[PDB]
Amino acid sequence: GCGELVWVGEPLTLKYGVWMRDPKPTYPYTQETTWRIDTVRQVFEYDLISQFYPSKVHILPRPLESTGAVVYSGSLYFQGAESRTVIRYELNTETVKAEKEIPGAGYHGQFPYSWGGYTDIALAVDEAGLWVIYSTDEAKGAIVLSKLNPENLELEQTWETNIRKQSVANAFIICGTLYTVSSYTSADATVNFAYDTGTGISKTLTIPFKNRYKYSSMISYNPLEKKLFAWDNLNMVTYDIKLS
C-alpha cells in the first residue's frame, strides 16, 4: 500500500486548463467528477468525464495566487492571491468554510522553487490527508511542511526539513514523505531528496525524473490513483510510481 519511492514513470500527456480530481470523493460528487481552473477565479465543474461542457461554474470569493491548489473531500483548498492565506471553499454549497494565515509563510516571490513564479506556498494531499509546503524567514528558506486539519485548517503538525526550497525545482508528498525534484540544467532531473515525516529521517536520492520544461510545474500527487499529476502550463501529465 505505502512505502518509499523507488521509481517514477515517463510523463504521459492526458478545454485547456488545470484539471483537479478529488482523492476522497464525497457525495454528491463521485470519481467521475472533475474541476477545471481557467488560466484564475472561476472553477468549472464537470459531473461526468464525458462532459469533461461544464455542469456548473463556481465563482470564488478571491482569485488564486497560483495553480498549487487541491480538491479534497468536497472542498477546494487554495491560496489567496497576494497573501499567505489558505482558503477552504466547499464546492457543493459554494461556502467559505475556513481561512488560515500560514504562520510566518513567505509569499509572492519570497521562497519560490528554483525556476520561480509565485510558488512560495503549495497544497498537497496524500494517504494521510492535507498538507501545505512553504518556508519562513525563521527557517531560512528551508522547506517547511505542515499537516492541515481539513475541517478548520489548523496546523496539526509541522516539520522543518533540511533542504533549501529555492534550490529545488518542485516537491510532492507520498505516504507521508516529502520528495523534491532537482533543478539541473537538463531535462534529466532527479528526485534528489526525501524527508519522512513519520520518522524525521531524510536522505539524498538519485531517482530519474523526466521533466520537459524549466518551469515551476504544478505537481499534485493523487493517493486514490497512486499517480502523480502535473501541469506544465501546456498539458496535464501523469507519472506512474512504484513504492518499496
Side-chain angles (χ1 to χ4, degrees), residues 37-44 57-64:
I37 315 156
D38 196 15
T39 61
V40 195
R41 186 173 179 175
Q42 287 176 325
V43 188
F44 293 78
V57 175
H58 301 286
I59 182 62
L60 298 174
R62 298 167 60 181
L64 278 69

Side-chain angles (χ1 to χ4, degrees), residues 9-79:
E10 297 288 335
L12 308 189
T13 300
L14 297 188
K15 273 290 181 122
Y16 277 114
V18 194
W19 296 99
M20 300 179 292
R21 297 219 276 267
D22 194 339
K24 198 198 124 190
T26 304
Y27 182 92
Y29 305 123
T30 74
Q31 260 169 256
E32 293 295 272
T33 311
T34 320
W35 295 266
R36 205 188 91 247
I37 315 156
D38 196 15
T39 61
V40 195
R41 186 173 179 175
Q42 287 176 325
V43 188
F44 293 78
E45 187 174 282
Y46 305 77
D47 281 336
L48 279 54
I49 288 185
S50 54
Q51 17 184 285
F52 154 73
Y53 290 67
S55 61
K56 183 178 180 183
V57 175
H58 301 286
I59 182 62
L60 298 174
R62 298 167 60 181
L64 278 69
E65 173 79 338
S66 80
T67 58
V70 172
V71 178
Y72 175 66
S73 188
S75 285
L76 177 73
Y77 298 85
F78 69 99
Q79 177 197 1

Side-chain angles (χ1 to χ4, degrees), residues 182-194:
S182 68
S183 58
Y184 297 153
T185 63
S186 167
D188 61 11
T190 64
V191 182
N192 66 328
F193 177 84

